[PDB]
Amino acid sequence: ERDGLFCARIFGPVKDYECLCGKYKRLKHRGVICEKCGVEVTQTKVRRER
Amino acid sequence: VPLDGGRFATSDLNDLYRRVINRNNRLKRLLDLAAPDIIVRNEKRMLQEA
Amino acid sequence: KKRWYVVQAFSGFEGRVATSLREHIKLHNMEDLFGEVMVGYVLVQMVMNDASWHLVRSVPRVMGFIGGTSDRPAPISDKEVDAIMNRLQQVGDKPRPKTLFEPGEMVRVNDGPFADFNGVVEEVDYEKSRLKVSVSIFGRATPVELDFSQVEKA
Amino acid sequence: RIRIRLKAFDHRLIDQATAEIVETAKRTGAQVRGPIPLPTRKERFTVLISPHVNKDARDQYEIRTHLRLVDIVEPTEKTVDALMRLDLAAGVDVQISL
DNA sequence: CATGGGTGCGCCAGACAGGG
DNA sequence: CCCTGTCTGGCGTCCTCTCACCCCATG
């Protein structure tokens, strides 16, 4: 969901270092907010601590 | 996580958090246009019990 | 004189609760003890006898009244009943997206693919309710049309 | 749905660059109107060349700017970012009006 | 398709009334 | 206030191996 129980910006990206869909599909800019959708850019276990 | 079929077998805490957020959104709506005392007393009481 | 009261129903079956309530009134013919029924809460113009109280709680899919106590339940402590109707009607008629992107004013985008970007409104269209602002994409300000609510005033 | 009006000075460049601006769209949006050329603005400056007398030796100059339109069909969010954010070819103006 | 709301256990123990 | 009865809570062995089945309902 955009801003629901399982958000993107509030917690983190489901996929490791993938922002959301069309943004950052390599290892260069880890952190930029995907222009298409608000989301963090981190690993896969980052949501477990947040 | 889903099961073999594909329907998501959801945890119990998601039911609890989703209830609290549904009631909290209703109570905030009962603060903007809002409604009389008996209504917001039942609304806050349902949030307390949630 | 008939005063108002609040009834709680199973939320979702509310029209059927209202119909069954009118039908229980015209069954047990206490027609002089009920005025209207307004629509998860059902508003009832009523008087308070224990017979009519048992009548409304014997209507199916009704939990009970909502008041200070269950002996003598409570009429209407109007705190924002009028405010509910007023704001609902106002929003339903139209919203209030104040033209954020004004001709010659920097703005902020938080919607679509241009989300999280700022720009300036070179042209504005109050009649079409659209602001002409360009967002520096790869440096190139990409003149795009965004709604007042789609962008924020900077 | 979205007018894509792009300007550049070189014709072999603006027309090369319009091939990939629909190849980055028909790959995802899969519907574009078509490459529409537009009549070019030729601005002339004919002016003297000597630092004094002989106002009969002039050199005719002309700067040609071209315009192209493709006017993409589908406003799906995927296609929007694949054009708005993905602008290529430095020295080529591109301006969009949704 | 969204969302919305039984009646077979037994001991210990301490807190809350309830006399006393 | 000093003892007596009630009312609710807290708790009760460890590893394994299959099986079956997980929210209607509907204008």
Resolution in Å, one decimal place: 5.0
Minimum Cα–Cα distance from B17: chain A residue:
A5
CB C14 within 8 A of CB C3: no
Amino acid at C129: S
Q: Which of C27, C25, C9 is nearest to C17 (CA)?
A: C9
Q: What distance in Å separates the CA atoms of residue C137 and residue C109, rounded to the nearest whole number?
A: 12
Chain B hits for A5, CB-CB cut-off 8 Å, are: 14, 17-18, 21
Distance A46 CA to F11 C1' (A): 39
Non-local (6+) Cβ contacts of C142 within 8 A are C114, C134, C135, C136, D84, D85, D87, D95, D96
Q: Is A1 on the interface with B (CB under 8 A)?
A: no
Residue C41 CB in 7 A reach of strand E: no
Q: What total number of domains does chain D contain?
A: 1
Q: What distance in Å separates the CA atoms of residue A31 and residue B34, rounded to the nearest whole number?
A: 41
Give the domain range for residue D11.
1-98
Nucleotide nearest to C15 (CA to C1'): F27
Q: How far is CA A1 from CA A7, A9, B17, D95, in A?
A: 6, 11, 15, 33
CB D3 within 8 A of CB D68: no
Nucleotide nearest to B2 (CA to C1'): F22
A34 is in an annotated binding site: yes
Nucleotide nearest to C63 (CA to C1'): E5
> Rounded to 10 degrees, what is the CA torsion of A13, A18, A20, A22?
180
Q: Count the Cβ atoms, other than its own, within 10 Å of residue B47.
A: 15
Q: Which of C126, C85, C80 is nearest to B27 (CA)?
A: C80
Distance B41 CA to F8 C1' (A): 28
The answer to whether chain D touches chain B by having 3 or more C-beta pairs less than 8 angstroms apart is no
Non-local (6+) Cβ contacts of D44 within 8 A are D60, D61, D62
Q: What distance in Å separates the CA atoms of residue D83 and residue D6, rounded to the nearest whole number?
A: 12
Distance C59 CA to F8 C1' (A): 36
Q: What distance in Å separates the CA atoms of residue C25 and residue C39, rounded to the nearest whole number?
A: 17
Technique used to solve these coordinates: cryo-EM
Residue B32 CB in 7 A reach of strand F: no
Residue D97: give its domain's CATH number: 3.30.70.600
Q: Is A37 on the interface with C (CB under 8 A)?
A: yes
Non-local (6+) Cβ contacts of D67 within 8 A are D5, D6, D7, D37, D38, D39, D40, D41
Q: What is the distance in angstroms between the Cα of D29 and the nearest Cα belonging to chain C?
A: 15
